[PDB]
Homo-oligomer: A and B are copies of this chain.
Amino acid sequence: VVEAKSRIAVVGGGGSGSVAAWLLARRHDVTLFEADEYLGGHAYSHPVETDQGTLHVDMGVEHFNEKLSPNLFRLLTDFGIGTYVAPSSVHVDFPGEQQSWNNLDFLGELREELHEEFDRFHQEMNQLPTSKQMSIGEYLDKHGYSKSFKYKAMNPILSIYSGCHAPSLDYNLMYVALSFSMNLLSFFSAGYWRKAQGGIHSYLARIESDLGERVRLNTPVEAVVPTQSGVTVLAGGQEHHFDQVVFATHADVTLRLLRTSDQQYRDLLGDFAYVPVESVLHQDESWLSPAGGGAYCQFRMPEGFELARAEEQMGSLTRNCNVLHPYRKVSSPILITFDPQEDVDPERVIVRREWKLPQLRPVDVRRKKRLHEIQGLNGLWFCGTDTSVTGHEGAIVSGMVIADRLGVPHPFPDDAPAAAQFRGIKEFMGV
Contact = CB atoms under 8 A, between A and B. Distances in A.
Contacts of A118: 85
A390 interface: no
Contacts of A85: 118-119, 122, 188
A395 B64 CA distance: 36
Contacts of A417: 130
Interface in A95-142: 104-106, 115, 118-119, 122-123, 126-127, 130-131
A200 B359 CA distance: 44
A143 interface: no
Nearest to A107: B294
Contact of A325 (B115, B127, B131, B294): B115
A253 B84 CA distance: 48
Contacts of A83: 123
Contact of A192 (B87, B115, B186, B415): B186
A126 B66 contact: yes
A119 B190 CA distance: 15
28 contacts: A65-B126, A66-B126, A66-B127, A67-B126, A85-B119, A85-B188, A87-B189, A104-B104, A104-B105, A106-B325, A106-B328, A115-B325, A122-B192, A130-B415, A130-B416, A130-B417, A131-B414, A131-B416, A183-B183, A183-B189, A183-B192, A186-B192, A188-B190, A188-B192, A189-B189, A189-B191, A189-B192, A190-B190
The copy count of this chain in the complex is: 2
A366 to B, nearest CB: 26
A208 to B, nearest CB: 26
Contacts of A104: 104-105
A77 B293 CA distance: 38
A27 to B, nearest CB: 27
Contacts of A67: 126
A230 to B, nearest CB: 42
A126 to B, nearest CB: 5
Interface string A54-98: 000000000001110000000000000001110100000000000
Given A84-B119, A85-B122, 12 more contacts: A83-B123, A85-B119, A87-B188, A87-B189, A104-B105, A106-B325, A130-B416, A131-B414, A131-B416, A188-B192, A189-B190, A189-B192
Contacts of A416: 130-131
A123 B192 contact: no
A337 to B, nearest CB: 23
Interface string A403-431: 00000000000111100000000000000
Contacts of A328: 106
A112 to B, nearest CB: 9
Contacts of A188: 85, 87, 190, 192
Interface string A380-395: 0000000000000000
